[PDB]
Scaffold this active site. Structure first.
Site, PDB file in Angstrom:
ATOM      1  CG  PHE A 142       2.838 -49.304 -35.662  1.00  0.00           C
ATOM      2  CD1 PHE A 142       2.057 -50.162 -36.302  1.00  0.00           C
ATOM      3  CD2 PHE A 142       2.499 -48.743 -34.645  1.00  0.00           C
ATOM      4  CE1 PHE A 142       1.022 -50.492 -35.923  1.00  0.00           C
ATOM      5  CE2 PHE A 142       1.301 -49.033 -33.961  1.00  0.00           C
ATOM      6  CZ  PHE A 142       0.508 -49.879 -34.727  1.00  0.00           C
ATOM      7  CG  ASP A 228       6.928 -55.148 -40.741  1.00  0.00           C
ATOM      8  OD1 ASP A 228       5.995 -55.480 -41.613  1.00  0.00           O
ATOM      9  OD2 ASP A 228       6.622 -54.798 -39.508  1.00  0.00           O
ATOM     10  CE  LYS A 257      -1.802 -52.978 -42.675  1.00  0.00           C
ATOM     11  NZ  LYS A 257      -1.769 -53.913 -41.553  1.00  0.00           N
TER      12      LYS A 257
HETATM   13  C1  LIG Z   1       4.653 -51.934 -41.080  1.00  0.00           C
HETATM   14  C2  LIG Z   1       3.720 -52.770 -40.199  1.00  0.00           C
HETATM   15  N1  LIG Z   1       3.972 -53.998 -39.954  1.00  0.00           N
HETATM   16  C3  LIG Z   1       3.162 -54.716 -39.133  1.00  0.00           C
HETATM   17  C4  LIG Z   1       1.907 -54.155 -38.620  1.00  0.00           C
HETATM   18  C5  LIG Z   1       0.722 -54.974 -37.817  1.00  0.00           C
HETATM   19  O1  LIG Z   1      -0.437 -55.133 -38.699  1.00  0.00           O
HETATM   20  P1  LIG Z   1      -1.698 -55.803 -38.011  1.00  0.00           P
HETATM   21  O2  LIG Z   1      -2.544 -56.443 -38.703  1.00  0.00           O
HETATM   22  O3  LIG Z   1      -2.538 -54.147 -37.313  1.00  0.00           O
HETATM   23  O4  LIG Z   1      -1.350 -56.473 -36.453  1.00  0.00           O
HETATM   24  C6  LIG Z   1       1.616 -52.616 -39.015  1.00  0.00           C
HETATM   25  C7  LIG Z   1       0.153 -52.126 -38.665  1.00  0.00           C
HETATM   26  N2  LIG Z   1      -0.515 -51.232 -39.376  1.00  0.00           N
HETATM   27  C8  LIG Z   1      -1.635 -50.607 -38.974  1.00  0.00           C
HETATM   28  C9  LIG Z   1      -2.417 -49.693 -39.363  1.00  0.00           C
HETATM   29  C10 LIG Z   1      -3.920 -50.270 -39.043  1.00  0.00           C
HETATM   30  C11 LIG Z   1      -4.481 -49.986 -37.540  1.00  0.00           C
HETATM   31  O5  LIG Z   1      -3.682 -49.916 -36.567  1.00  0.00           O
HETATM   32  O6  LIG Z   1      -5.686 -50.144 -37.494  1.00  0.00           O
HETATM   33  C12 LIG Z   1       2.510 -52.113 -39.811  1.00  0.00           C
HETATM   34  O7  LIG Z   1       2.468 -50.837 -40.378  1.00  0.00           O
END
Ligand SMILES: Cc1ncc(COP(=O)(O)O)c(CNCCCC(=O)O)c1O
EC number: 2.6.1.13
Length: 404
Positions: A142, A228, A257
């Protein structure tokens, strides 16, 4: 009178999109490891905004950086220079030891940037004919909600009803070096993108040696290794990068994050010159990418993670947490897995008893957690949690699980 929790729920239901069904709890305050709802009730946060608040909610240093910068300058756009961006770039690229960083806002943008970098490098350095460049991903990945991101997904809820899908994205199973080798036989492959631990899939920790395998397989076939670490990076798993556990240097590193402590959407793409310099002026960017306010926040967040040694804390406390979670009865909790303060449990789901109900009762006992599907519960508290607090939250997890 201020809105009640039910009032909050109905209002979002009335005027907001139904793209979420969150745990029925309506918070209005947060600090450190704790959250507070409109009724004043106190909760342990065991999700940490998907690692975005590794430093805890509203960490004072990052708040001070935001406040100090907001009065000076917030957004020049990239048509002109601001004074902060170079400072941030130098700091972060020397912290992770890459030549260069490309700043973006959200994690999915960092992923998109990585994909564009991979394709440009393939066409212009590897000699792949336009437009035959392929990027391989792992099933269960994801990395966002854009059309590209869901085009790599094996989760029907991500992609179903949103096609047609991006071409050039090959999918192989996670934690499978032979599948990666077979996939990397194609000379048109530009990159393999992978999570050191699959977060949203349910904290899937691959087998020892997988990451080193991936590094070797990418190096041997002239393929870019994209790690990632948006969820796994920045102290969450017990190292500055999860890949550090195997001493692996990816070709591209994705950050987000906890890069802001939750105060500002900041993501980063890190790589050396031979990859980064394939993108020329005018070919990629973002309005808010690299704005001075986010840069100040990011410098502060990274400083917090270093100065309070949150990586070592996460490692030790994750040891303790997984140990205590293993003592739960195997007939009700079928598995416990993770690294550092990224952990999950798998429960023996039944028709009437699922992870959602467990999270509801955990909430009732003052602990907030997120269920994945019907059988996975994530446990990921902020890295500032103390042992005395981690125990007590463990005591809530016990009692809740054995109440059913
Ligand atoms: C490993 C990893 N890389 C990239 C991403 C993408 O990060 P964005 O800021 O949601 O675009 C994620 C997205 N995380 C999402 C949880 C929050 C939600 O969906 O409301 C991730 O888990």
């Amino acid at each position: 009178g201020p809105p009640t929790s039910d009032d909050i729920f109905e209002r979002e239901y009335k005027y907001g999109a139904h793209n979420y069904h969150p745990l029925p709890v309506a918070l209005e305050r947060g600090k450190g490891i704790y959250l507070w709802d409109v009724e004043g009730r106190k909760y342990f946060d065991f999700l940490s905004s998907y690692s975005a608040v590794n430093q805890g909610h509203c960490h004072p240093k990052i708040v001070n950086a935001l406040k100090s910068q907001v009065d000076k300058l917030t957004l020049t756009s990239r048509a002109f220079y601001n004074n902060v961006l170079g400072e941030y770039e130098e700091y972060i690229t020397k912290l992770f030891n890459y030549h260069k960083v490309l700043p973006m806002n959200t994690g999915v943008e960092a992923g998109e940037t990585a994909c564009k970098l991979a394709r440009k490098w393939g066409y212009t350095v590897k000699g792949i004919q336009k437009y035959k460049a392929k990027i391989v991903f792992a099933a269960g990945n994801f990395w966002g909600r854009t059309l590209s991101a869901i085009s790599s997904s094996t989760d029907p809820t991500s992609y179903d009803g949103f096609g047609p899908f991006m071409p050039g994205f090959d999918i192989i199973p996670y934690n499978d070096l032979p599948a990666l080798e077979r996939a990397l036989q194609d000379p048109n492959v530009a990159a393999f993108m992978v999570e050191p631990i699959q977060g949203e899939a349910g904290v899937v920790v691959p087998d020892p040696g997988y990451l080193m395998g991936v590094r070797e397989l990418c190096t041997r076939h002239q393929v870019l290794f994209i790690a990632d670490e948006i969820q796994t990076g920045l102290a969450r798993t017990g190292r500055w990068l999860a890949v550090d556990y195997e001493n692996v240097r990816p070709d591209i590193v994705l950050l987000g994050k906890a890069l802001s402590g939750g105060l500002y959407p900041v993501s980063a793409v890190l790589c050396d010159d031979d990859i980064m310099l394939t993108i020329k002026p005018g070919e990629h960017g973002s309005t808010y990418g690299g704005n001075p306010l986010g840069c100040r926040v990011a410098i502060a967040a990274l400083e917090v993670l270093e100065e309070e040694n949150l990586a070592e804390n996460a490692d030790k406390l994750g040891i303790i947490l997984r140990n205590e979670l293993m003592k739960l009865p195997s007939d009700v909790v079928t598995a416990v897995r993770g690294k550092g303060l990224l952990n999950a449990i798998v429960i023996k789901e039944t028709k009437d008893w699922d992870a959602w109900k467990v999270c509801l009762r955990l909430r009732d006992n003052g602990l907030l957690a997120k269920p994945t599907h019907g059988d996975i519960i994530r446990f990921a508290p902020p890295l500032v949690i103390k042992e005395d607090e981690l125990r007590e939250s463990i005591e809530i997890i016990n009692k809740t699980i054995l109440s059913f």
